[PDB]
Design a protein around this ligand. Structure first.
Ligand SMILES: CC(=O)N[C@@H](COP(=O)(O)O)CN1CCC[C@H]1C(=O)NCCc1c[nH]c2ccccc12
Length: 147
């Protein structure tokens, strides 16, 4: 059992079992629960100095380090999981992609269209699920599967 990518792990603080997905970098306490032709996702992208294109609508020259980008991503994930802020609101404000203007929506796509790590993560998510930090040449993503 356990859907594609999902793995059982041991909490270092609690000793309690949790579940981690090595394709999406999602992690959760609850036990997870065939791959479709197309999926629809939104994303929030945080670029860094090592991004293939180190600029965005947010800032002409992106200078933060990959490590600093990951901290931001982790912070947004915390805000989303706690309900303090919703994904769509953070994507509109903070994503270094033009899709920010559409609350992060990329529309529907099939395999063979996106960068591979993004694609694999997108197709490993079930409808409604969100990834952890996903790394591509563009930067670091949080991905939400909407369809
Ligand atoms: C371009 C964009 O809107 N954002 C990119 C910003 O990153 P750069 O500044 O380019 O490095 C980041 N993309 C979004 C997720 C992965 C990445 C990607 O693979 N784009 C290919 C675009 C693409 C190909 N067919 C699609 C079908 C639907 C939607 C998008 C696409």
């Amino acid at each position: 059992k356990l859907p594609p990518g999902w793995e059982k792990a041991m909490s270092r603080s609690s000793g309690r079992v949790y579940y981690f997905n090595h394709i999406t970098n999602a992690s959760q306490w609850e036990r997870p629960s065939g791959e479709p032709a197309r999926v629809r996702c939104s994303h929030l992208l945080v670029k860094h100095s090592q991004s293939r294109r180190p600029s965005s609508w947010r800032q002409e020259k992106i200078t933060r380090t990959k490590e600093e980008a990951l901290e931001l991503i982790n912070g947004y994930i915390q805000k989303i999981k706690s309900g303090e802020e919703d994904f769509e609101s953070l994507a509109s404000q903070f994503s270094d992609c033009s899709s920010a203007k559409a609350r992060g929506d990329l529309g529907a796509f099939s395999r063979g269209q996106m960068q591979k790590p993004f694609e694999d993560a997108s197709f490993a998510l079930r409808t409604g699920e969100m990834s952890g930090p996903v790394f591509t040449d563009s930067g670091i993503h949080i991905i939400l599967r909407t369809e």
